[PDB]
Every structure is written in C-alpha cells, then in structure tokens.
C-alpha cells in the first residue's frame, strides 16, 4: 500500500515542466477548461513542423508557494522563464505602430519586451481599434512557452530525442536510414550535429538533404565539428532565405581586411593575438550589432568559411542574438553589401 508511495516521489525527471499558480489551474485541468492544453500541443506540433523534431511533453501541476497568477517554466528542473497571466483579463500588446493609450496594469509582453497593458474584457474592442494586439490569458503562457522552447531547442534535443527523430524518419526514408546508423555514422555523433544545427537556429525539417549529405562525407570522417559545416553548406539555400527572405539585398556584418588576415594566422599556427585584441574583437562586434540594428538590418556576420565555426561559438557565448554565416552558405544569386565592419579605422 504505502510501499509504492516512496518510489513515486523519486520517479521525477521531467525534461520540460511548468509549475502553475492556483488561479491558473482551471485552464490546466481537463475537467474545467483545457484551453491551455490544446494550446500546448498546438505549439508542439508547429515546432515539430517548423524545427524538425517533436519537443518533450510539458507536464504541469500545482505550486502554492508561488503567487496566484504566476507561472514558472523550467527545463529538467532548472528555471528558464516566468511571468504573470491574469485569467480574467486580456493582454493588450502594442507593436509600436498602434496609436493611443489604455487604462490598466502597465507591463511588457513576456517574450519580446513590447509595451503591453492588462485590460478588462469590455475594453477588448477598444485596444483592437487602437491597433493593440489583444491576447488571451492562456495564450500569454503558451506564446511564452513556445518562445522559450525555440530559445532552447538544442538543449531540449537529447540522445533520446534523436532516436525518435531517427524512428520517425526511418520509415518514410528507409533506404537512407538502415545503412546510416550505426553503419556510417554513430548515433552519438549523429545527434551532436543536428544539435549543432539547432543551437545556431538552423532547422532540421529537411532530413533527406541532411542524411544524403552524411552518406557521402561521413564514411571517412566522423568529427561532428566538420560534418556540421558540411551539412550546413548543403542547407545553404534555406539558411540564406530565412535571414534574407525574398530576393532583396543581403546586407551583412563584415570583418576588417586586416583582422581576418590576423585572425587566420592565429589558427594557421603563425601567431595568436594578445588577449586584449580578443576582448577588443568582442567590443566592436557589439557596436556592429547595434549599428546593424540602427539601420534595420539582420544581425548576420558574413565570414570566411575557415573562420565560421570559431567566431560562431566564440562570439555567441556572450552575444546569442548574432548569426555567423559562412561565405559558402550564402547563395550565389544574391548581391552583398557590407554595412557594418569589425576592426575598422
């Protein structure tokens, strides 16, 4: 009787959990209204169809030590996000364009930081005329969970997630899968290159091109560091058209003609720089980001292919918003213009 109570306090290990305040229990229980439950699997399906893999299910239950309207999202036990959701009220978000003001609790949306107001339902039509995006309560939690899942797509993608990706893809594409793992490339390294792509916001939707590429390079090379760059080049048209959608002008961040030279000889064995230059490199990268942001341009640093993996992991530990692309990853049929530069004069 009591013997099974002990083993189920210890059975816990949820890869993504959300603890909820008591007034947000209704939208979480199937017997009251499951409006958040339908929201959570809606966003889980889109993520499977936008990112490539199905995320671990969110298991949610109560926590009375937190305030009534506050939800906490946390990943395998460590906290990633939080915020308020008032079930009786609506969130009126302003994307800067809408005109005017509205009464109620002044706040900012939990995902992007836009100015927002919590409003009563009678004023729902008010904010819509003004141009404010009126958003329900269950949605604020779902949209914030969706945004935080995408920010942590790589970490959510563990060894067990790669195998169910293998399984799902092994049966529509059987000829590309039976010989591949563990024949060509091992499952350990197979998982680490798709995680490498997710950590740089590169989607995994096209598994065919990813596996077709591996069949040709992985037989006599299984460093996940080099296979990632090889796979990235194969996905080069999708990478281009997601940060440069359409056929407009590719305005990138560039490196100094002397810095890139000095940077190559560091890895080339002919002399690494003073540490102060490395901190100086980080400094102008921040100014290049804010510059490209002051002209309304994507935060893309277009780089020599040999320098791409280094500067990517070196500059994104501190500036995660930066995107570091290779010259081989950008398409041919695109006209380039450097708008910001790191290391100038």
Author numbering: 348 to 692
Could you pull the original sentences from the published paper?
The flagellar protein export apparatus switches substrate specificity from hook-type to filament-type upon hook assembly completion, thereby initiating filament assembly at the hook tip. The C-terminal cytoplasmic domain of FlhA (FlhAC) serves as a docking platform for flagellar chaperones in complex with their cognate filament-type substrates. FlhAC (residues 328–692) consists of four domains, D1, D2, D3, and D4, and a flexible linker (FlhAL) (residues 328–361) connecting FlhAC with the N-terminal transmembrane domain of FlhA. Interactions of the flexible linker of FlhA (FlhAL) with its nearest FlhAC subunit in the FlhAC ring is required for the substrate specificity switching.
We found a new orthorhombic crystal that diffracted up to 2.8 Å resolution, with unit cell dimensions a = 71.7 Å, b = 96.2 Å, c = 114.1 Å and the asymmetric unit containing two FlhAC molecules (A and B). The residues from Val-349 to Val-357 in FlhAL of Mol-A form an α-helix, which interacts with the hydrophobic dimple of a neighboring Mol-A molecule related by a crystallographic symmetry. Trp-354 fits into the hydrophobic dimple, and Ala-351 hydrophobically contacts with Pro-442 on the periphery of the dimple. Ile-7 and Tyr-10 of the N-terminal α-helix of FliS is in the corresponding position of Ala-351 and Trp-354 of FlhAL, respectively. Tyr-10 fits into the hydrophobic dimple of FlhAC, and Ile-7 interacts with Pro-442 of FlhAC. These observations suggest that FlhAL and flagellar chaperones bind competitively to a common binding site on FlhAC and that the dissociation of FlhAL from this binding site is required for the binding of the flagellar chaperones to FlhAC. When Ala-351 and Ala-356 of FlhAC-ED in the crystal structure were replaced back to the original Glu-351 and Asp-356 residues, respectively, the side chain arm of Glu-351 can form a hydrophobic contact with Pro-442, suggesting that FlhAL can bind to the hydrophobic dimple of FlhAC even in the wild type without the flhAED mutation. Because the introduced Ala residues would increase the helical propensity of residues 349–357 of FlhAL as seen in the crystal, we suggest that the flhAED mutation allowed residues 349–357 of FlhAL to efficiently form an α-helix to stabilize the binding of FlhAL to the hydrophobic dimple of FlhAC. Far-UV CD measurements revealed that the flhAED mutation did not affect the secondary structures of FlhAC. These suggest that FlhAC-ED adopts a more compact conformation than wild-type FlhAC. Unlike wild-type FlhAC, FlhAC-ED and FlhAC-EWD did not bind to immobilized GST-FlgN at protein concentrations less than 10 μM, indicating that FlhAL with either of these two mutations inhibits the binding of FlhAC to FlgN.
